[PDB]
Write an enzyme that holds these catalytic residues in place. Sequence first.
Site, PDB file in Angstrom:
ATOM      1  N   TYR A  30      -1.129  -0.059  10.834  1.00 48.64           N
ATOM      2  CA  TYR A  30      -1.220  -0.382   9.409  1.00 48.64           C
ATOM      3  C   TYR A  30       0.067   0.026   8.686  1.00 48.64           C
ATOM      4  CZ  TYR A  30      -3.407  -0.632   4.680  1.00 48.64           C
ATOM      5  OH  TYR A  30      -3.728  -0.967   3.382  1.00 48.64           O
TER       6      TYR A  30
ATOM      7  N   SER B  94       0.855  -1.182   0.000  1.00 51.00           N
ATOM      8  CA  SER B  94       0.000   0.000   0.000  1.00 51.00           C
ATOM      9  C   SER B  94       0.900   1.244   0.000  1.00 51.00           C
ATOM     10  CB  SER B  94      -0.848  -0.002   1.279  1.00 51.00           C
ATOM     11  OG  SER B  94      -1.416   1.253   1.600  1.00 51.00           O
TER      12      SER B  94
END
Lengths: 261, 261, 261, 261, 4
Positions: A156, A143
């Site tokens: 995250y 990501s």
Amino acid sequence: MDPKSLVGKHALVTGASRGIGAAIAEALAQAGARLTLVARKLQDLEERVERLRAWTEVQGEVGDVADPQAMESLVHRAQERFGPVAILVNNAGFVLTAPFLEINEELWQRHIEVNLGAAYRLIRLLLPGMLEMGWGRIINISSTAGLTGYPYAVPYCAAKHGLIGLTRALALELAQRGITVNAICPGFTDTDLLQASVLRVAQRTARAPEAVLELFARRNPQGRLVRPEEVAWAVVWLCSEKAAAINGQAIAVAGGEVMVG
Amino acid sequence: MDPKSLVGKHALVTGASRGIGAAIAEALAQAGARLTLVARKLQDLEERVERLRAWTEVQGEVGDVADPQAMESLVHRAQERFGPVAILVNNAGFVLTAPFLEINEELWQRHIEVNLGAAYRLIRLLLPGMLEMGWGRIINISSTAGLTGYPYAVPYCAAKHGLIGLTRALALELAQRGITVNAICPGFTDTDLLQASVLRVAQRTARAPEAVLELFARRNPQGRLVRPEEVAWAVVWLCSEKAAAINGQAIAVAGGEVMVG
Amino acid sequence: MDPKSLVGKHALVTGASRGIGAAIAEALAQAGARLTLVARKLQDLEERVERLRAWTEVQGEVGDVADPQAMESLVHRAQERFGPVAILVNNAGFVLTAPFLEINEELWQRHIEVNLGAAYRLIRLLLPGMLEMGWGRIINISSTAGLTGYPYAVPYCAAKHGLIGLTRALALELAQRGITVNAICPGFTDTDLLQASVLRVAQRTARAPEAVLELFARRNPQGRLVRPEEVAWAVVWLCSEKAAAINGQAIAVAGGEVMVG
Amino acid sequence: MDPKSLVGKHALVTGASRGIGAAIAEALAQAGARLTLVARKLQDLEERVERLRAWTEVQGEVGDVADPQAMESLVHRAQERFGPVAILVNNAGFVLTAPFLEINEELWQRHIEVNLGAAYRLIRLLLPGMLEMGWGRIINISSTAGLTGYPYAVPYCAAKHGLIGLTRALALELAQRGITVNAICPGFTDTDLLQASVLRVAQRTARAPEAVLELFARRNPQGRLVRPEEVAWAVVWLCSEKAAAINGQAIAVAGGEVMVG
Amino acid sequence: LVPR
Ligand SMILES: [Mg+2]
Ligand SMILES: [Mg+2]
């Protein structure tokens, strides 16, 4: 890519029933690869398998990538039917944004295990087969949170950055073994799950969904969301033999939000 | 820096009994900070505390940073004596190099918990005090393995990269709260642990330790190892109020091995 | 720094009459370095020299850093008075924001010559002296535009990125020659030059200058402009002998806008 | 012919008679693009044009990319025959390795003009046509020297890094204009141009050319030189409409020598 | 989970 490029190559894709995983599976199917699609739910997985059988031999398997015993058995069943896996696409993700102090040990561990630990265990299970064949491709879907920070997404970002670290170190370790290890780092992508979150906040703030979509697309300099097919295009490109010199790279698919170097 | 710069600032340093941690504690003590030194063993910790009491008020606490209950109690005892912690230096590390397939779940978890999880738990415990004071400094000692890959060090690179991700996301989250979050990434540093490994390989390859030191220093363009004092110099620089604009950065202390951007 | 101060070290600083350059000169003067301050105008340069003579031996020289003949003569006069230059701070900048197609050959060349060419020529003139002495520091003041892109600033980004490339390659070439080469990359800094750029973009985007000032401070996650003293703090830190391991680095002074790694 | 992806798209490639440029032209021709091939010499350009006419409509034009008047006329002639240019591949390069002090103003300027200035002028000439069409691709062939430093290649690194800065800023400026701007950064590639650089460094370091070839291949973790086809593969991938989200990126084609993020 |  050519129509018969990855013919005779077994590719395994996780998180394959919908969104990015579905588009990756579709691009690999159009390239001629034999596919094993892994997802948590039976619904949407069997429909995706039936749709993709128009291009190649496809197979579906249900399992939780966090559970090691379930994955060890799933891998054995898939390799029994289509042989050893030559291309692995790790596409398992989880994000629950919150202030750092509101993240307990359990929630911290869940971010680490889903976004990083699952890829480690699947690579550990499928890498001997790739070394035996003398060729392989490990593609980790990370990501933009693996390349830059975001407030309220500390676990995250830590787990996705860890996946880039795993990608880089393993790329060097397998450099002379016929296998490349790369990461694809998408920004906000137009998926059915994202469209439900847009529609939910639009219904709760008395706004049109198009106005809410502007908030999500704001970080992308192109003023739109990334399409799942655009993430898939970067994945299939790497599977070619002409992409052997692409190793240890993090390819950002985010319109210029993150500019790698 | 000034001789009375960090006077009246409580600094907590982990892995403080030897090497990089000891040099960091020494540099913070010469700057006037009140210190809490945390280490696994009683032996070199008490000796370091006695030596550093010539410059400032020092305190020693033994505990395993992997154990959350032990750290929760340790933090309470330290803050009772020297007040809330204003400067936190996370310097806990663990590396066992091996081929990727020889890394079992236990060894993978140990790399993640010591190099990343311990920093998360200590920040979670000491951040409320920093927010209450309106000022703070969180300095994470990562490594060049947090910025680039190394073969046979996949779990170490994954955890150290995760620490950069934690650093970046938390720097943005606390940007307007008076606290800066930065990482210092040393290359191979001249410590007693490293000198044992150099003397071991010299005694196994029939070579002088100076010739083996060349192999370890080869990745450093300067042709020498990084000194622990040089890592400590980068830590104390960040603690100044003039370094408030330095936030979310990874400072490589490796002679040009990794050139950040 | 008090124990390893810069007494007996000749430092030459360009763009020294105001802003970042003035703060750098002030920090180096308080550290005890003999200074040669270069600026385009005589006005604020002589006032800065008179003020800084309270801390050290200072000298002022007027000249255009783009003109090679003027700089070749200026360097000769400065080294005649204070000997060879040990610390060089390249702080010459020029930015004229506009759409890419509105940048003619002359304006493109001006961005390249002021932001990159001037640093090349000054390093070429002063590097033999540093090699003769066996010690030196080359510090290039680049920008966040040397690490990331900005629309309407294509020639400025190209020249400032080129300065990072010069920094990195020369750091490797001089790694074992006692000289470190580093770049400091500030974001929007509170200076008179910034106020001119604010008024320029306000007149081009049909916005009030106060809205433009807020938009530029919004790029900094800390919600404020960088102070010139904060940029100077990073410069003086590098001049210490304890910063010898800092080589080929780009230090961002921008509150988290750019997070290097 | 089956691959009909870039049919009806005019692509202009510089440095097209041999090496990387020749492989790029071949890959674009097999994809169906109409080609304008620019090279300094008539030798090898006409032969390449005759060979590539078997796949698509090809045109050859001789000119020095450093000369603006020659390029302004060349562009006019090429656009008169095949219409406005939709895909621009800037592949003009020049490197003469030497110690920094042995690089005079003339040689410094040649590195800046060929590796950076030529791309600026060609983009300035062809961008109005791309904006008019609402679609375009600008692909800058930079190098690993645009992402990291190399000793004895300071002007080459400065110019190639500047091309990444141009790439990044222009990608953001054209993000909502239908055009993507990206850079491909190859490592040491197996070409006739590389053999000249090998012979040059061998004659300057008193070493055999075979030892120099091995030293350059040792920087690549894969233990081999990059193939020109591998660089070309990364170029054609970007020209697809499915690569619209790839913008402002630097793609390293060097086996893991540089790992972007 | 349909095989084949
Ligand atoms: Mg890098
Ligand atoms: Mg970055």
